[PDB]
Design an enzyme around this catalytic site. Structure first.
Site, PDB file in Angstrom:
ATOM      1  N   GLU A   1       0.850  -1.171   0.000  1.00  0.00           N
ATOM      2  CA  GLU A   1       0.000   0.000   0.000  1.00  0.00           C
ATOM      3  C   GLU A   1       0.896   1.234   0.000  1.00  0.00           C
ATOM      4  OE1 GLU A   1      -1.592   2.409   3.000  1.00  0.00           O
ATOM      5  OE2 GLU A   1      -3.473   1.247   3.036  1.00  0.00           O
TER       6      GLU A   1
ATOM      7  N   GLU B   1       5.128   4.440  11.550  1.00  0.00           N
ATOM      8  CA  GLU B   1       3.688   4.424  11.691  1.00  0.00           C
ATOM      9  C   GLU B   1       3.251   3.406  12.746  1.00  0.00           C
ATOM     10  OE1 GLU B   1       2.508   3.693   7.600  1.00  0.00           O
ATOM     11  OE2 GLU B   1       2.464   5.878   7.285  1.00  0.00           O
TER      12      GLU B   1
END
Lengths: 420, 101, 444, 220
Positions: free
Chosen positions: C60, C137
């Protein structure tokens, strides 16, 4: 089904906008010219408390019925507001508009502000304000407006601390009686037939004509408010007096905005079409963000950039954002940059209306600070009709104008307005 | 009619709370409704009620009453709470009715 | 004017046409100048294994850093310059990449999409960069209690299965995943029969599918290539996981029983049921007068900062439960009332409650089709999960057939006397004993 | 001191130079009374220019000498008095730091009258920078200053402080006659100059209260 957008303007100056898009759901709203802008050192925060007071008992419906009533038909009731406009709207399925309308009508035109209800509500200002301020983003904007102005707009959007619990039923009543006047209100409404929305506005909207309290002119201060609070991230915003709503110079800034860069279009992506972003990127090495800041108010506006960066690198990051603004004021704007922007702006505008909320907002905003609906092709015509020069000028206006700065975080390495 | 309108004045004097300098509303048993009403009274009314009541308790412990001059007169008795209490009860009845619906 | 009943009927139909390579193309044409088109893929962490967990998420991150036909800089510049917004996501069973642009660019968009899913550059240098990013993240998401809690909820509710894994993957998998694994994942999962090109806004279904045949080529040879793989079933487990950190300011708790899965109609009733209990948060102005009993109690007794009900669905299963955030000393009472409300659902729901619950549900479904992106999301999802589109007109039909008696039977069927899955994070000392909680699962 | 103190040698961390900003921080807090202070870079300690300001201080007026009394010998007080009608206070503010100093005035006044009160304090400063200082004012001041100094040492605390302050930022004890010699040796011009330095220098202002009628640094 697909046509029109009527818009009457009753005797007292009360504007009624309307558009039937045959959506299974409706969304009616009362736009009003009111906000912390009309507050005085004497009644600060009253606008904020009024915002949280929407569910309090009214002359026609009780606090209990307002909530149970709306909820009974899967409806909703909310109040959005800026420093100068307050919108009270309700949503629901087409078949319940008449039901949900009663409460909307009651809340905006017949509040009772019973002392006890009002007293129990006030501690909520402390809560409401506490969650909002979780976004550093909000703290600096408050201080920005307080550094950019000496009055009206300088007034905070969230009730200041010292005043929590000190607002009175008087002030609320007086604030409403002097601002929620037919000449300052518009009854917009998506998902309904104009005749219906009009028959309502008539037989029921009582608080008639007037223009009541007029906000003092927005004087420009050009101050610098800093907030040392430790945060590893420093949020800084440097601006200058910009265009006002419906100002000719407006469209110019809005474009210089996109040229400089205002918000990413690609998830986790880098923004190449953003001169500002790109510029800062070449300056710092660590994570950060930078955007073109632009606000257009009735009698004034603000323009500049906003930056979030690691403390130690705020220096380099802010300078960079500046050099990129000067570099643009000195003809550093391609005829193509102006072309790209113009599109991003038209696109952004067009996408920002797919939302029931987005559309109602767009419609009602005009019908209040105008009384007309500028066709989309017209707004388009106005946008691209902006020369490459207009853009370079807007930039100039910034490099030359008196700047006001608002920053917060571990400002230990953050420059002062006079060092840029 | 102005018939029992006299009876009342009679009962009012028979009751005798006026001898303690108490208002009719001062003598109400504080159930739930009354408790809510009291929270709504303005500061001044509330403190006046408080002093009146404390004053009465002190007379009661002393086994005395106020001099005849200081007795509350039927027609000068302030129904300071009746208004709030009437509201509190309607609200309640509204909710009660609505929650069955 | 026009009734809700009619406005529902006059809604433009959703056109769907399958290609020869197996890809399905669907759209809902509106009179809007702006549109949203993207591909919804039936892939995600559930399809990953113990060694490639996190690949779909790593993919992604590269999905946008350029394709082979046009490198990083070019790709971004091309999308940015047309005022188009490129976004997407990846979950346990569903991935997506979609674009928001002017209907005018619909075809060029479709070309961009197809280029992304089919030709990801997977630049060796880029991968080492997204590696550090994803690792960041993770540390960020690690501080979002709500997600840490739902991850744990899955980790235990579906312990020892594919659904037990997080979408982002492990620290190990991310520190070592290879250009190959990412390639392999894409070549293994992003395939026509498992994808759906959905579009919403002002677009001609035909112009769409035409532009589709043109850029979605890859035609399969073997029978294996166009057969949609059935995933091994995930076993649910009544159990709990307690991650305690008294240093955290507030505690998060999530409780849930096993749901039926997309296909089942009962999901309509479960959603109605969730509407009765609903949700809350300290900024709901309605306060003590809210119709939701749990919300009222929450207000009257300061039981929590917030709470939410949910009915998360998956192909063959799901999670039906609730999550709340409360102060260390009110956890117990909150849980008490919450489970209490579930028992009310199974034993004493009122027509008044369902009547209102339905209206709330109707508004909710309508509100889920407020814009092109959201309408597109619906189409991509419905096709991938129901194998077709379910119009609001249908949903409403189903929603209107629900009554008290039905809510009680459905709820009893999924909640009453069931062993739940519990996840608690934070200063949770006052919440306690699975046994005690398990007993809250019966007798109104 | 010797056979006992151990953490030693050197001067360790050195403070960064005192850069001058010249900002204006306002604090809206409701208080019926507004406290405002407007200053400018003043004189450093040990600086000859010090004495000058200290004197301009007393000339302008720094603290009452008569209980509940009016201060006539205070130009600043007197000036403001003629300006406002309601209760208030105003004084000469003066701080002398190692590498810098601050000078100006400080005013406490009812909100609504902060405007008139601050202006007044200003006009009285300009009026002084324009030779509005009698040779006598300079004489009176010089005394109030020598007196104030001399009284501020009767205290065990006051004395130790005086002594220690020198022995640290010097290493010597300036005899009282010397400090006296230094004080009166201040011309009437020096004083008018100090005042000039204020009217010309970049000012920084700090105020707090119901500033609704309080002026901004750029409005003085």
């Amino acid at each position: 089904g697909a046509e029109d957008l009527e818009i009457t303007k009753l005797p007292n100056g009360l504007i009624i906008a309307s558009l039937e898009n045959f959506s299974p759901a409706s969304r009616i709203g009362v736009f009003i010219k009111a906000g912390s802008r009309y507050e005085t050192t004497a009644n600060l925060g009253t606008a904020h408390l009024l915002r949280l007071a929407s569910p309090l008992t009214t002359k026609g419906a009780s606090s209990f019925r307002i909530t149970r009533g709306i909820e009974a038909v899967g409806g909703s009731l909310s109040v959005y507001s800026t420093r100068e406009k307050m919108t009270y709207c309700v949503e629901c399925l087409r078949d319940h508009v008449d039901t949900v309308m009663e409460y909307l009508l009651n809340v905006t035109t017949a509040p009772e502000f019973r002392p006890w209800e009002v007293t129990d509500l006030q501690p909520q200002l402390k809560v409401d304000k506490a969650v909002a301020f979780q976004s550093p983003q909000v703290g600096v904007l408050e201080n920005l407006h307080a550094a950019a102005y000496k009055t009206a707009l300088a007034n905070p959007l969230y009730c200041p601390d010292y005043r929590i619990g000190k607002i009175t039923s008087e002030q609320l009543h007086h604030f409403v009686q002097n601002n929620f006047t037919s000449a300052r209100m518009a009854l917009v409404g998506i998902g309904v037939k104009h005749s219906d929305l009009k028959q309502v506005a008539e037989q029921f909207l009582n608080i008639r004509s007037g223009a009541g309290t007029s906000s003092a002119k927005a004087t420009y201060w050009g101050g610098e408010i800093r907030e040392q609070n430790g945060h590893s991230l420093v949020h800084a915003a440097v601006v200058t007096e910009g265009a006002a709503v419906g100002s000719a110079e407006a469209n110019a800034f809005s474009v210089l905005q996109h040229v400089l860069g205002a918000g990413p279009l690609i998830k986790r992506g880098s923004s190449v079409t953003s001169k500002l972003y790109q510029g800062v990127a070449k300056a710092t090495t660590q994570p950060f963000d930078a955007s073109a800041f632009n606000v257009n108010y009735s009698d004034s506006g603000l323009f500049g950039f906003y930056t979030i960066s690691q403390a130690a690198h705020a220096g380099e990051v802010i300078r960079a954002a500046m050099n990129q603004l000067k570099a643009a004021a000195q003809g550093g704007v391609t005829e193509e940059d102006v072309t790209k922007a113009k599109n991003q702006l038209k696109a952004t505008y067009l996408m920002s209306v797919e939302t029931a909320q987005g559309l109602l907002n767009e419609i009602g905003s005009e019908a209040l600070l105008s009384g007309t609906h500028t066709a989309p092709s017209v707004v388009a015509q106005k946008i691209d009709s902006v020369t490459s020069a207009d853009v370079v000028n807007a930039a100039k206006k910034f490099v030359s104008g008196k700047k006001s700065m608002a920053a917060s975080g571990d400002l230990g390495s953050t420059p002062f307005l006079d060092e840029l | 009619g102005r018939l029992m309108d006299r009876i009342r004045k009679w009962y009012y004097n028979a009751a005798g709370f006026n001898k303690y300098g108490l208002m009719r509303d001062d003598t109400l048993y504080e159930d739930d409704d009354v408790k809510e009403a009291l929270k709504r009274l303005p500061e001044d009314l509330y403190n006046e009620r408080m002093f009146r009541i404390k004053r009465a308790l002190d007379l009661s412990l002393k086994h005395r009453i106020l001099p005849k001059e200081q007795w509350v007169k039927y027609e000068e008795d302030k129904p300071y709470l009746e208004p709030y209490l009437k509201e509190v009860i309607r609200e309640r009845l509204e909710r009660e009715a609505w929650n069955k619906k | 004017a026009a009734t809700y009943a009619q406005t529902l009927q006059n809604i433009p139909e959703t056109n769907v046409t399958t290609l020869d390579n197996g890809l399905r193309v669907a759209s809902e044409e509106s009179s809007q100048p702006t549109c949203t088109v993207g591909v919804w893929i039936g892939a995600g962490s559930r399809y990953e294994n113990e060694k490639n967990n996190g690949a779909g998420y790593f993919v992604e991150h590269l999905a946008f850093k350029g394709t082979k036909k046009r490198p990083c800089a070019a790709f971004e510049k091309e999308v940015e310059s047309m005022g188009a917004h490129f976004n997407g996501y990846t979950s346990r069973e569903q991935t997506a990449f979609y674009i928001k642009a002017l209907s005018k660019d619909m075809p060029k968009v479709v070309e961009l999409l197809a280029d992304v899913v089919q030709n990801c550059a997977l630049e060796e240098s880029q991968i080492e960069k997204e590696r550090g990013v994803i690792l960041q993240e993770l540390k960020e998401m690690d501080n979002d209690m709500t997600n840490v809690t739902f991850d744990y909820l899955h980790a235990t509710a579906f312990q020892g299965t594919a659904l037990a894994r997080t979408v982002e993957g492990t620290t190990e998998n991310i520190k070592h995943l290879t250009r190959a694994d990412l390639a392999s994942y894409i070549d293994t999962h992003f395939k026509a029969p498992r994808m759906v090109l959905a579009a919403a806004g002002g677009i001609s279904h035909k112009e769409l599918v035409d532009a589709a045949r043109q850029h979605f080529s890859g035609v399969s040879f073997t029978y294996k290539e166009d057969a949609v793989p059935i995933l091994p079933r995930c076993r649910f487990t009544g159990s709990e996981i307690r991650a305690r950190d008294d240093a955290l300011p507030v505690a998060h708790v999530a409780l849930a029983v096993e749901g039926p899965g997309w296909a089942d109609p009962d999901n309509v009733v479960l959603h109605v049921a969730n509407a009765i209990i609903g949700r809350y948060d300290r900024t709901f102005g309605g306060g003590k007068h809210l119709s939701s009993r749990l919300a009222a109690l929450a207000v009257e007794h300061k039981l929590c900062h917030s709470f939410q009900t949910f009915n998360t669905s998956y192909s063959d299963t799901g999670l039906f439960g609730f999550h709340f955030v409360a102060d260390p000393l009110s956890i117990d009472d909150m849980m008490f009332c919450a489970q209490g409300e579930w028992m009310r659902l199974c034993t004493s729901t009122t027509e008044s409650e369902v009547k209102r619950a339905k209206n709330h549900l109707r508004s909710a479904m309508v509100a889920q089709l407020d814009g092109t992106t959201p309408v597109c999301e619906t189409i991509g999802s419905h096709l991938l999960n129901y194998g077709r589109r379910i119009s609001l007109e249908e949903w409403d039909s189903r929603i209107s057939a629900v009554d008290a008696r039905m809510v009680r039977d459905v709820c009893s069927k999924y909640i009453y006397d069931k062993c739940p899955a519990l996840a608690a994070v934070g200063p949770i000392e006052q919440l306690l004993d699975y046994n005690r909680i398990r007993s809250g699962m019966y007798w109104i």
